[PDB]
């Protein structure tokens, strides 16, 4: 048999209150309800009764109308409340005008599926699930609380604001938890906040199952600190019970929804484990007049509540033997001086309960004012109440409740509301309490951060992978989530193109410090400055000094026989070639200009061509033993090389090319090919070997102060140096400087061992 | 008002059949049902009536018991069937003993929530959703069909077997579609089969919504070919209607669940778009006796079915004016010769309907046999039927139905069943039909693949990312799914370590062809063989020939004055040093052995030390102008270098080190340091310069056939070559061969310009 609270009157308003707990497993089939509760139960029942009394005793709302009610124990279970709603609709086969629908969303849905057949409009006070906005399915559902879509938004705001990224997610099995979790999940997926593993559990579940759940949560412990427990009360309670049963007290943070809102009974005796826990409550002020009424209640007086005796038994663990509930299970007969004000905790959500009953009354008020304005009472139009007419009234109904705030309904029967955020911290010596921290309103999340933790070093932020981008090290996806990643450093060639991808620079470019992108390498020019460059400079300087020295001497001493006898013009050609050879040094060490790159090859070809051509003519003159045709012979042999140079310019212009020894170094050189080097060098070398042969053949002529002898000595050394500097130009990467040394030393040897002895004799 | 089919009798068995369609949007509030159906409707109704007739007319099952029934139109909608079930339980305030519960799972759940309060056991025939296995929530639910957990397994088997990986997923809004999709999703996540984007839609949804859904499916078209439509009939119907309304006829494959099982009406007039489509039906054989009964039905005769007239109206679009349903909406009065056998399509699932009613009867049979065996009929124990006793009977009940198969229930009220797979292909000239392809049973998926497509080139397999592992190119996760990846090639240094990660090899190693891992590089040894190596070999050969030549000559001609005059012993020291210098060539070109690496440095130090030491003593003898102390001087100068070599061996042993010019090439050399090279070379060079000075100072002594003259010439050339081969050893990477050339040519020059002229004179 069932127990029914009821107040008589004209118009009856049903309600479903979770007076008892849900039945446990292996009791759900008998449907025998658990232990009583006040804050979800008796408190709400007395709230309804006294609110109905107030509306009876107010001439403003519904004059000449005595409102009645029927309170049914929902027992928080789906089937139980469904049976109670059947007991409501028994009359529709006094008729109930509408209900103040049950707490949990799943139970609400189950009840409304029945109710909307009989056109009985349901007003919720706690059933916050967002799938109840679908007025196609749920025509008769108007809750005075916001949808938990906003609540999932608030939770995602919190986990963004405190940088939690790799979270665990437990939600209660049932429509509230499931729908709310789905909303939180997709919002988090959008806003880039991953979830380790979504778990689900019944509230009445086994301790074994709770322990399994807790171990599964343990399997993500070092990273997934905070649990996004979009849960309900007994779910969180069972979780904390499991935490103590494994002794994992101050292990990890959890973050609860309004199932855990402000409730002490879910933390009672398990306080040490919900520490630091963050919660979201719907913003409801205290109800002072209800306090005044509720605290003056006595079990000997409150006859009209058939649960009140049993509650009075339970709260004080005592017995009223002389009263209709002995409860022989207990002992220690009740002290007559017991009060409710001792540890009175006012329910959070019961403001909404008063608002809901107000909404029902105001709806009826609007209906009365519409259909029969000039008749205070039940006219002929309201003998049977049209449910749809009542709905039309209720959807348009507005007022201010005990909170004083405007109570209006949108197109979804969802009244707007705020949200408060509590932290469950310590106050003093093991006196733990929730305390208001911040508020959420339409996206606006204001919050006192320093209040949380009482310490600027917070809980370990639930991050799977540390921001390993130290300017260098990239993100490596193993394929788990978009928040778990290993890390690989980019190479010195490799700039961090993106978090995910790291493209290298190309040749001619090099990455910056922080590896954003490419740059340009400080290329080397090697003009005036640097040791080795300037080394050849001083060499060429000494060479040019000796050049001018011997030149002036041989100009002045033209009259002398020892100078006059030999071919002075051919000697002048030698001197000019030698001087141009020294100019080749300064032509090579230059800024990489096009005209310079031209003149380099010009010099390298022509000036040794000049020198060895005039020398081969001299060796011919000294060997064969025309006097004005020797110049013509030299002219021919020079113009061949000049033609070769011009033809090679026709073939390929020596342009200005970036050099790449490796990535780290880039030069800017003349793009003289191997053929362009070797071919004029080949012609020069062949002339060298030719004059070598013709001089070595006739080395035994001691004429003109051993002219041929010194020339043969010069030719020996000359050929040795030319053969020595063969592989060096090919092997080196400093090819220009090698060419400088080679040709400059060649001209040096030629001068020093042809004309310097003659000068030494002519001035000795 | 509502319409009730009923057969009178002793025991009444209720049932919910989807006679009409569901109400459309903006009709769901009036709850006015759509158009009639036979295959889900009238066919099933006649099935129940005739089955009840058979069980009445069978003396075997339940003798002296006239079974009755009440058929209620479910209308496929949740609320409608809920109202009908209220109309069932009106008596419980003839009592219905149990129902043959409605088609869809969501409606089944809604009905059972009501029924289990009144202890009325429900047997389903189509409500395949897996969440109905939870006997905690659903104590009174026994379906004669398997759970769709197996069906999701079958679908995942199919999408594995045909290598579909990147699929789209539409499921019907409602518990069947939702739960089945969840099962398919997590199984696919396990078995590595991704889903593009899960969509959901009501069946009665707007054409706008269908078009939105279709465009959202279009947004994944080139990759996500196959849609895993875990849907229901009208969902698939609306999808095909949208396909024609966008004219996207043969666009993409879909894969349907048993909502789409074998139904023609879901493809009727939209046949061209479900082409190639693959479906899963529960394996049920045809029912011949039902065929015989059903086809002989006449609208003038079938009074007992109050839907049959309206169905007869609908199927032929005609009118029976003289009969209680005129249907003035239609025209074209019915031909009296119309038959049902014209386009008779037998329902698939109605075998299960017959089995379900059989199960109810057999359960009652077991209950009768248990409680009152010796009284054929209703005893005192079965005046009111105990629902729980009936459940206990039904959970243990076994039989063989019209299919002939064993009908047993597990602990979950889920009878085992098979699955058949159809393809919706063409037969001929636009005559389209489903045809059986394969079967699924307990994991065993056998299937005729070649039958599908009639072509070995199938539909484009739904793959987001082609297997770009061509032995070279890796997987790059952009963070979408574990099936969408871009691709990056590994470098030549980089072996494919894994699909996700690609680690390079280290120095001393190199990747293989297919880039599995590292190998060992074929290192170079350069012993006998190769041009440049053997070049120095022939050089040393000619040198040793000349060595022995001059040696034998100076041994024989010891008696001669020109040989006798000079220090023969010191000359012998020169010759020995020179010969050891030639041995240095073959010591350098060797396999990299430790003793060899020792002897290399030994030779390079000592043999030029010997040569230049004996030469400096000779220059001292020839310059200062002791006779047996010259040997002692040479011994001192040699032992200094020998001490240096031994001390350097003490400092660092020249061990055998792998060379790294770059990654691609590795040599195996002696690890002679720069100091270990230069220091003995430094001592040698200082001796060279010393004897150079002492010889150049005294170059003007023409004694002993210009001995000092040729020696000075030798020293000139010697010093030039030593100074020439300075940067080459440092610049080259072929350092050993350079050292060979250098020291061998040095010894060559020394011999050729000291002792060869003396031999030429003594034999001229
Ligand atoms: C003091 C020294 C050891 C260090 C700094 C060397 C340079 C700043 C000087 C010293 C000699 C100079 C050169 C002396 C000879 C002339 C030739 C003459 O004609 C050119 O060859 C034009 C080319 C040019 O503009 O450099 C004037 C420039 C140049 C190269 C001079 C340019 C500047 C040089 C290289
Ligand atoms: C025919 C030629 C141009 C091509 C092939 C050359 C080699 C197969 C031959 C020719 C000369 C040979 C060398 C002649 C001198 C001797 C010295 C003698 O004593 C050693 O120096 C021992 C070292 C060793 O075992 O090689 C015997 C080996 C060796 C190096 C010989 C080894 C094999 C060589 C290099
Ligand atoms: C973490 O939170 C703090 C304060 O909200 C702030 O430094 C920043 O928003 C977050 N840090 C990062 C790296 O996003
Ligand atoms: C694709 O399917 C065929 C036959 O089932 C076969 O080649 C193989 O199983 C699949 N291919 C790959 C690459 O897995
Ligand atoms: N918010 C809830 C109900 N609720 O469950 C609890 O345990 N507390 C509480 O407020 C829902 O919408 O179903
Ligand atoms: N399998 C279904 C029911 N069903 O819906 C259809 O459209 N066809 C069909 O068989 C379910 O389990 O709910």
Curated annotation (Swiss-Prot), chains A, B:
User: What GO molecular-function term can you cite, just one?
Assistant: A2A adenosine receptor binding
Q: Where does L-glutamate bind?
A: 40, 105, 126-128, 176, 258, 349
What keywords tag this UniProt record? Cell membrane, Disulfide bond, G-protein coupled receptor, Glycoprotein, Membrane, Methylation, Phosphoprotein, Receptor, Signal, Transducer, Transmembrane, Transmembrane helix
Q: How does it sit in the membrane?
A: Multi-pass membrane protein
The cellular location(s) given in this protein's UniProt record come to: Cell membrane
Major localization class: membrane
Q: Which GO terms describe its cellular component?
A: astrocyte projection; cytoplasm; dendrite; dendritic shaft; dendritic spine; glutamatergic synapse; neuronal cell body; plasma membrane
Q: GO terms for biological process?
A: cellular response to amyloid-beta; chemical synaptic transmission; cognition; desensitization of G protein-coupled receptor signaling pathway; G protein-coupled glutamate receptor signaling pathway; learning; learning or memory; locomotory behavior
Q: What does altering residue 567 to D do?
A: Decreased constitutive signaling activity
Which residue intervals are topologically Cytoplasmic? 557-566, 697-709
Q: Which cysteines are joined by disulfide bonds?
A: 33-75, 194-483, 229-231, 318-334, 372-379, 464-484, 468-487, 490-502, 505-518, 597-670
The record's subunit annotation is: The PPXXF motif binds HOMER1, HOMER2 and HOMER3. Interacts with SIAH1, RYR1, RYR2, ITPR1, SHANK1, SHANK3 and TAMALIN. Interacts with NCDN. Isoform 2 interacts with NECAB2. Interacts with CAMK2A.
Q: What is this protein called?
A: Metabotropic glutamate receptor 5
Which taxonomic lineage does the organism of this UniProt entry have? Eukaryota, Metazoa, Chordata, Craniata, Vertebrata
Q: Which gene encodes it?
A: GRM5
Residues of the whole record sequence present: 25 to 827 of 1212
């Amino acid at each position: 048999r069932r127990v029914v609270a009821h107040m008589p009157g004209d118009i009856i308003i049903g309600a479903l209150f979770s007076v008892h707990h849900q039945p446990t497993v292996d009791k759900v089939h008998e449907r025998k309800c658990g232990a009583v509760r006040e804050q979800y139960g008796i408190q709400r029942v007395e709230a309804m009764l006294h609110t109905l009394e107030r509306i009876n005793s107010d001439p403003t709302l519904l004059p000449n109308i005595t409102l009645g009610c029927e309170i049914r124990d929902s027992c928080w279970h789906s089937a139980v409340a469904l049976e109670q709603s059947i007991e409501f609709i028994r009359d529709s086969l006094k008729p109930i005008v509408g209900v103040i629908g049950p707490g949990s969303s799943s139970v609400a849905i189950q009840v409304q599926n029945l109710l909307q057949l009989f056109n009985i409009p349901q007003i919720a006070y706690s059933a916050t699930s967002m799938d109840l906005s679908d007025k196609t399915l749920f025509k008769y559902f108007m809750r005075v609380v916001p949808s938990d879509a906003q609540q999932a938004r608030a939770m995602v705001d919190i986990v963004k604001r405190y940088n939690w990224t790799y979270v665990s997610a437990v939600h209660t099995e049932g429509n509230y938890g499931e729908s709310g979790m789905e909303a939180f999940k997709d919002m988090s997926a959008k806003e880039g906040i991953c979830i380790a593993h979504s778990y689900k559990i019944y509230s009445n579940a086994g301790e074994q199952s709770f322990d399994k759940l807790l171990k599964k949560l343990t399997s993500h412990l070092p990273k997934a600190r905070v649990v996004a427990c979009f849960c309900e009360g007994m779910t969180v309670r069972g979780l904390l019970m499991a935490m103590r049963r494994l002794g994992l007290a101050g292990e990890f943070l959890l973050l609860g929804s309004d199932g855990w809102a402000d409730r002490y009974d879910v933390t009672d005796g398990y306080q040490r484990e919900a520490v630091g826990g963050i919660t979201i409550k719907l913003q409801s002020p205290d109800v002072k007049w209800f306090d005044d009424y509720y605290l003056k209640l006595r079990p000997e007086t409150n006859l009209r509540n058939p649960w009140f005796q049993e509650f009075w038994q339970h709260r004080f663990q005592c017995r009223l033997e002389g009263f209709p509930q002995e409860n022989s299970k207990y002992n220690k007969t009740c002290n007559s001086s017991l009060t409710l004000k001792t540890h009175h905790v006012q329910d959070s959500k019961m403001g909404f309960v008063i608002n809901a009953i107000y909404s029902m009354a105001y709806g009826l008020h609007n209906m009365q004012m519409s259909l029969c304005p000039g008749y205070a009472g039940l006219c002929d139009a309201m003998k049977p109440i049209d449910g749809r007419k009542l709905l039309e009234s209720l959807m348009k109904t507005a007022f201010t409740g005990v909170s004083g705030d405007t109570i209006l309904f949108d197109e979804n029967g969802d009244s707007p509301g705020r949200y408060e955020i509590m932290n469950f911290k310590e106050m003093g010596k093991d006196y733990f309490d929730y305390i208001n921290v911040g508020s959420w309103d339409n996206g606006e999340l204001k919050m006192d951060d320093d209040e949380v933790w009482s310490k600027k070093s917070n809980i370990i932020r639930s991050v799977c992978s540390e921001p390993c981008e130290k300017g260098q090290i990239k993100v490596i996806r193993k394929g788990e989530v978009s928040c778990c990643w290993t890390c690989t450093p980019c190479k010195e060639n490799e700039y961090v193109f993106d978090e995910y991808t790291c493209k290298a620079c190309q040749l001619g470019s090099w990455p910056t410090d922080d590896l954003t992108g490419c740059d340009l390498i400080p290329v080397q020019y090697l003009r005036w400055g640097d040791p080795e460059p300037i080394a050849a400079v001083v060499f060429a300087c000494l060479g040019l000094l000796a050049t001018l020295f011997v030149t002036v001497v041989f100009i002045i001493y033209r009259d002398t026989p020892v100078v006059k006898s030999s071919s002075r013009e051919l000697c002048y050609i030698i001197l000019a070639g030698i001087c141009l050879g020294y100019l080749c040094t300064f032509c090579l060490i230059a800024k990489p200009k096009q005209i310079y790159c031209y003149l380099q090859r010009i010099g390298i070809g022509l000036s040794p061509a000049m020198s060895y051509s005039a020398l081969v003519t001299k060796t011919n003159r000294i060997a064969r033993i025309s006097a004005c045709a020797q110049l013509v012979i030299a002219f021919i042999l020079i113009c061949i090389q000049l033609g070769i140079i011009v033809a090679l310019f026709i073939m390929e212009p020596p342009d200005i090319m970036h050099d790449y020894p490796s990535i780290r170094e880039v030069y800017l050189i003349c793009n003289t090919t191997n053929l362009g080097v070797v071919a004029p060098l080949g012609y020069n070398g062949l002339l060298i070997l030719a004059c070598t042969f013709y001089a070595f053949k006739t080395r035994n002529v001691p004429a003109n102060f051993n002219e041929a002898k010194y020339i043969a000595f010069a030719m020996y050394t000359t050929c040795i140096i030319w053969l020595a500097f063969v592989p060096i130009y090919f092997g080196s990467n400093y090819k220009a400087i090698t060419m400088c040394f080679s040709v400059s030393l060649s001209a040096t040897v030629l001068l020093g061992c042809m004309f310097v002895p003659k000068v030494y004799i002519i001035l000795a």
